[PDB]
Structure 1
Amino acid sequence: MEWTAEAVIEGCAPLTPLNMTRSIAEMHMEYPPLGITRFFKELGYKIAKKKGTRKNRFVGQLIEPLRRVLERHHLFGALTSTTPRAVFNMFRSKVDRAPVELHSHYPGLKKMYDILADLWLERYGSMKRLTEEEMASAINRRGAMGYQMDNRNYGDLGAYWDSGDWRQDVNTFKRALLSGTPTHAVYNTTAKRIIQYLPADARLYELKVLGGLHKYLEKCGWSVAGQGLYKYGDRVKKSMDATGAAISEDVAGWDTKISKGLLTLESHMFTKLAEDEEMAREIHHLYRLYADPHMVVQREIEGEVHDVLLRGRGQVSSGRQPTYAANTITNFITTTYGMAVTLGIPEADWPRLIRDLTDERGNRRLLVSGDDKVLFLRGDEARVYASSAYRISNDMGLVRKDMALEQESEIIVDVKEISFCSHRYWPVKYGNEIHYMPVRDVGEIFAKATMAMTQEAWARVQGLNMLVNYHHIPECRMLALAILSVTRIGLNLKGITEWLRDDLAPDTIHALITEGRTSGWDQLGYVDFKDRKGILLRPDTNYKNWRRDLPEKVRQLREDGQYKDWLQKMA
């Protein structure tokens, strides 16, 4: 289907497509396009090789006795590689869908982007490019290199980073981008959902230029940027206490629905924040890339596997480091706008509104992380919001997941029923105080801890993370202590913070949750026995047998390293 016209947004620099001839030629397409997509425009294809699931040996073997109940009563879910046929079918089903570019809400959205940018600049100043030390802290060392870099034989981002060759490469990327004819600008893809990512040099560049957005979010009361999961429940509780009603709605396929119009506003805002005029040019040129995404996706026809070069318009790619910060900001702005219009908040009050949301003052609160949000309102405003705010997000194509288009919002009045960041939050006692701590299906928890000496270091970090965040769930505390008992001391955990250490102890956990008002293993709380069902493991004979055999399993899994016994910190 032909693309609609684009939105023309007053006061914003248009995101003109770059000259992509150089980056297209880098993909070495062989054949003219077949054209079987409805939105993406196929430019060509080439014959490929079928592209690709492995469980961590340490975590996997420790939970092996529970695999059956976790697969039968929970959401563990396992694993075969996705076929090219299945990859293209999922692309067509979920990604090959035109964003809604044309609607009447850009002028008011722009006003709020401008308000937020002005508040950040007034309070915190402009945004510098990341330093090398800052980039080293944020890179995923296991990330892929990308087809355009595969012939340099680095293996992964970590090895590429360590080599130091990226320093010249990112400046080569910068110069070509600013010229209007970029190199290495075509997205690679892999299935896990389709992940889209630029080559490693491009990714280090975009991290350097846009990585500072997280620093502003750390200052915002509506963001959880930089904060650990163990803090989120208390923030949900605090926000609810100030309001009394919550609306928690997910958008189906958020990344696929973001329009070039919204990207135009993102770029507008971020260029406002830049330290110097060259930085603003760099940001604007990156968004000229983002808004005109070219990507290679696999398919299979008559037994022949193709690498297909496709061109879209708008949308958001997942394997882009700024995506989290940009999604969070755009989610905050679109949600605040729809709420303010629906509740009739006058536009002259919008600067105060955005300040109060940022300062957690007043009778309206937001919590936002990427495409996930909870809106908190008094009951009276919640009813007004629930009755019609969906019309504005529908206008923008931000259709809500799993409900009818014009279904009124569900108004949540119990803090324990609010889903945020894929968890709910339950009250847990630490000594004589209560903190709200995260729960979700334990099959999901265990699966994420299993599906990736790097392997041992990775497992050990999963155990440290599980102990800090899920010690209130007994099976999670047990698995964590077992992980820490089977993984050796002295590994490089930082390559995989406050608690990321071999000598982790309760005092560190109490410092994070109660600021050290409590102490000891005995004041780390548990959920009530009566609630150990449903999303949590029922404590039946299967569970008690696993617990009985864990000490032996730990001893059998240990090898040549130095280990410490952690299971004695519990039953």
Structure 2
Amino acid sequence: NLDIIGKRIEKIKQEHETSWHYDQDHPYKTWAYHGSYETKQTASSMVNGVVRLLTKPWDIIPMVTQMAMTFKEKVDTRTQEPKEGTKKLMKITAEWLWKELGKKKTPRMCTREEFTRKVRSNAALGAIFNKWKSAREAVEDSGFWELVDKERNLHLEGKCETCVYNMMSRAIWYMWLGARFLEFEALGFLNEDHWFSRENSLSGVEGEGLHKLGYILRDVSKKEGGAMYADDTAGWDTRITLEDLKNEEMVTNHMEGEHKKLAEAIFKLTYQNKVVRVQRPTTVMDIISRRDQRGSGQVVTYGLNTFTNMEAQLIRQMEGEGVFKSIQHLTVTEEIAVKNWLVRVGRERLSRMAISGDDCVVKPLDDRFASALTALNDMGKVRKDIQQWEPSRGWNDWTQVPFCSHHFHELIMKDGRVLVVPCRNQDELIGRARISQGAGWSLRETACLGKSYAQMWSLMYFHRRDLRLAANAICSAVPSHWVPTSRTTTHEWMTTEDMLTVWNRVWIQENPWMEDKTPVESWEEIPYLGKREDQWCGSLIGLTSRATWAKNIQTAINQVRSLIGNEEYTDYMPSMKRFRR
């Protein structure tokens, strides 16, 4: 308790000695409260004018226009202690899973040098503004690293002074850059060295773009078994137990020397004990603490979510196969059955899954899995939008399984080769491309962000008639040589290479499911969904608004060219049959 967080709490108290007040009207039941102090501040979504001007028909579609307008009752909840049989299943599974993941990988420290190179090309390493402006400045100043050194030796002593979270179905906890470095130092290897790659973890999909995920689901479908299950968890990060955090910390068992002690400190001092500052309007800062739930950086969060999801889904598979009879208690013979199951079929059962953080698809041995719910509920991983003891509804067709906010279509090229393509309701895609985050965007920066969306559409969503047309229009309206941008970043569309050359590299040359490597010579060789399937997934094809937009598209392109001004532009519209004269 307060010995681990006291020092952190004692330090904040004294930067605000002209404020500290133990509020009696504090709203916390599950978060431990420590005090308050004086503050006052708040980033709302802005519209991308280049994308909106080139998507006029969607100006009257509420599902698009409402996306640009405008659960903290879930963070203040309390997951119960699992039973002893559940705790034993999780510890045995976690111990086996870290060994499998570590067979072909070496844990290692990430460096000041790697951290610097990343901050100098923008990943979302959630830091704060304030002694230096950006992270980009702090990383050059020896002051910062001296501060990092102080905290580091403190962590080696089993103590913490400055690793404090900041709060803001989405709750995002920023720390100062120093604490983010120490996390990266100790645990960055999980992401940097691809521990959750499909090759290394069998269930995972780390480094897999949307052009891979559909092929992976189709390979899972080829397994003998029952339906494909894709149950979402209700608020996964809020259901991570202290038991889960202790099983995750067992990765330290594979480490050595300094690295081991540094990683143990991150787990002990910042994950299994947390200190958070929160803005309450009644505007005072609430310094609160808890032991459980997920509060790491987003990249470490992704890897530990993947690990604990893989563990939970193997245990649900064990329950469906009758490996254990009750979660109340494991017999000695049932522990040896679990261990022997993992050794005998563990890797085969991982290969039955596709797991991206809290997202999963499982193709179990048979449909007993659907009603195998005691371990899943007792681990606290309660299914979203279904009654707690109602059996899961599975999918009979891999093309209708939801995963990573998509479904996947099988599309046959005029030459017989098979594309497995990502898809989602088209209003969602248009709605997202019409939004920018943050302020002070120039017209050139706004245009380069529109071009990033247009190029993503050409590569991933070429099979949607409206998106291939709108992508060609945006790429015609934005100067040919301007570089696509994004203030939050496999993204093969982030390039000034010709999009047909990138299409060939991604879908043909580098595609391990495609045996015939014959390059495609024009966009007209690249197929669409059936016209009715395109409408089912939200196409406006057949509407009067869409026909007028398509026919008059050069007028829209010329409106945006006139706003940007006298620049070099390329006409991409004749890459499509209907404009090719």
Matched length? 528
Which residue pairs with 1:62 in the alignment?
54
Distance apart, 1:414 and its partner CA: 1.1
Going from structure 1 to structure 2, the CA distance change for 1:204 and 1:551 (only over 3 Å counts) comes to farther
In the alignment, does 2:251 pair up with 1:249? no
Residue 503 of structure 1 aligns to a residue whose secondary structure is coil
Task: Confirm or deny: 8 A CA contact 2:5 2:160 kept in the other structure.
Answer: no
Residue 555 of structure 1: which of 558, 564, 575 is its match?
Answer: 558
CA distance in structure 1 between the aligned counterparts of 2:569 and 2:267, rounded to whole angstroms: 49
Cα deviation per residue 1:464-523 (whole Å; 9 max; x = unaligned)?
A: 222211111122222222332333324375985654311233232233223344513123
CA distance in structure 1 between the aligned counterparts of 2:536 and 2:505, rounded to whole angstroms: 31
> Which shifted more, 246-255 or 482-491?
482-491
Residue 183 of structure 1 aligns to a residue whose secondary structure is coil
CA distance in structure 2 between the aligned counterparts of 1:135 and 1:272, rounded to whole angstroms: 28
Distance apart, 1:434 and its partner CA: 2.1
- Aligned-residue Cα RMSD (Å) equals 2.9
Which residue pairs with 2:217 in the alignment?
236
Instruction: Kindly report which structure 2 residues correspond to 1:208-357, keeping only aligned pairs within 5 A, or say none.
Output: 208-214=185-191, 215-218=194-197, 219-244=200-225, 245-268=227-250, 270-274=251-255, 276-288=256-268, 289-301=270-282, 305-317=283-295, 319-345=297-323, 346-347=337-338, 348-357=340-349
Task: Confirm or deny: 8 A CA contact 2:483 2:495 kept in the other structure.
Answer: no
Q: Which runs of 5+ in 1 are unaligned?
A: 1-5, 7-14, 81-89
Residue 22 of structure 2: which of 19, 28, 32 is its match?
Answer: 32
Which residue pairs with 1:21 in the alignment?
9
Instruction: Kindly report which structure 2 residues correspond to 1:81-100, keeping only aligned pairs within 5 A, or say none.
Output: 90-91=71-72, 93-100=73-80
Distance apart, 1:119 and its partner CA: 2.1
Which residue pairs with 2:356 in the alignment?
369
Which residue pairs with 2:459 in the alignment?
468
Which residue pairs with 1:197 in the alignment?
174
Residue 417 of structure 2: which of 420, 425, 433 is its match?
Answer: 433
Distance apart, 1:40 and its partner CA: 0.9
Task: Confirm or deny: 8 A CA contact 1:472 1:527 kept in the other structure.
Answer: yes
Residue 483 of structure 1: which of 466, 474, 477 is its match?
Answer: 474
Task: Confirm or deny: 8 A CA contact 1:40 1:311 kept in the other structure.
Answer: yes
Going from structure 1 to structure 2, the CA distance change for 1:426 and 1:96 (only over 3 Å counts) comes to same
CA distance in structure 2 between the aligned counterparts of 1:213 and 1:181, rounded to whole angstroms: 24
Task: Confirm or deny: 8 A CA contact 2:22 2:36 kept in the other structure.
Answer: yes
Task: Confirm or deny: 8 A CA contact 1:399 1:405 kept in the other structure.
Answer: yes
Going from structure 1 to structure 2, the CA distance change for 1:107 and 1:466 (only over 3 Å counts) comes to same
CA distance in structure 1 between the aligned counterparts of 2:296 and 2:552, rounded to whole angstroms: 41
Going from structure 1 to structure 2, the CA distance change for 1:133 and 1:554 (only over 3 Å counts) comes to farther
Going from structure 1 to structure 2, the CA distance change for 1:55 and 1:351 (only over 3 Å counts) comes to farther
Instruction: Supply the AA of the counterpart residue of 2:532.
Output: K
> Which shifted more, 550-559 or 322-331?
550-559
Distance apart, 1:335 and its partner CA: 1.1
Instruction: Supply the AA of the counterpart residue of 2:253.
Output: K
Task: Confirm or deny: 8 A CA contact 1:75 1:442 kept in the other structure.
Answer: no
Which residue pairs with 1:10 in the alignment?
none
CA distance in structure 1 between the aligned counterparts of 2:94 and 2:119, rounded to whole angstroms: 26
CA distance in structure 2 between the aligned counterparts of 1:449 and 1:100, rounded to whole angstroms: 41
Cα deviation per residue 1:232-274 (whole Å; 9 max; x = unaligned)?
A: 1111111012135211100010000101110111011x21333
Distance apart, 1:417 and its partner CA: 1.6
- TM-score by length of structure 2 reads 0.83
Going from structure 1 to structure 2, the CA distance change for 1:509 and 1:79 (only over 3 Å counts) comes to same
In the alignment, does 2:182 pair up with 1:180? no
Going from structure 1 to structure 2, the CA distance change for 1:243 and 1:478 (only over 3 Å counts) comes to farther
Task: Confirm or deny: 8 A CA contact 1:143 1:157 kept in the other structure.
Answer: no
CA distance in structure 1 between the aligned counterparts of 2:14 and 2:214, rounded to whole angstroms: 48
Residue 217 of structure 1 aligns to a residue whose secondary structure is coil
Q: Which runs of 5+ in 2 are unaligned?
A: 324-336, 438-443, 510-516
Distance apart, 1:17 and its partner CA: 5.9
In the alignment, does 2:94 pair up with 1:113? yes
Going from structure 1 to structure 2, the CA distance change for 1:145 and 1:240 (only over 3 Å counts) comes to closer
Instruction: Kindly report which structure 2 residues correspond to 1:360-439, keeping only aligned pairs within 5 A, or say none.
Output: 360=351, 365-378=352-365, 381=366, 383-387=367-371, 389-430=372-413, 431-439=415-423
Which residue pairs with 1:84 in the alignment?
none
Task: Confirm or deny: 8 A CA contact 1:66 1:542 kept in the other structure.
Answer: no
Which residue pairs with 2:327 in the alignment?
none
In the alignment, does 2:527 pair up with 1:525? yes
Sequence identity, in percent?
A: 22
Task: Confirm or deny: 8 A CA contact 1:26 1:184 kept in the other structure.
Answer: no
Kindly name which structure, 1 or 2, has the bigger radius of gyration based on alpha carbons. 2
Task: Confirm or deny: 8 A CA contact 2:449 2:486 kept in the other structure.
Answer: no
Which residue pairs with 2:37 in the alignment?
46
Task: Confirm or deny: 8 A CA contact 1:292 1:312 kept in the other structure.
Answer: yes
Task: Confirm or deny: 8 A CA contact 2:500 2:523 kept in the other structure.
Answer: yes
CA distance in structure 1 between the aligned counterparts of 2:236 and 2:39, rounded to whole angstroms: 30
Residue 294 of structure 1 aligns to a residue whose secondary structure is strand
Distance apart, 1:368 and its partner CA: 0.2
Cα deviation per residue 1:431-455 (whole Å; 9 max; x = unaligned)?
A: 3122221111122212332333544
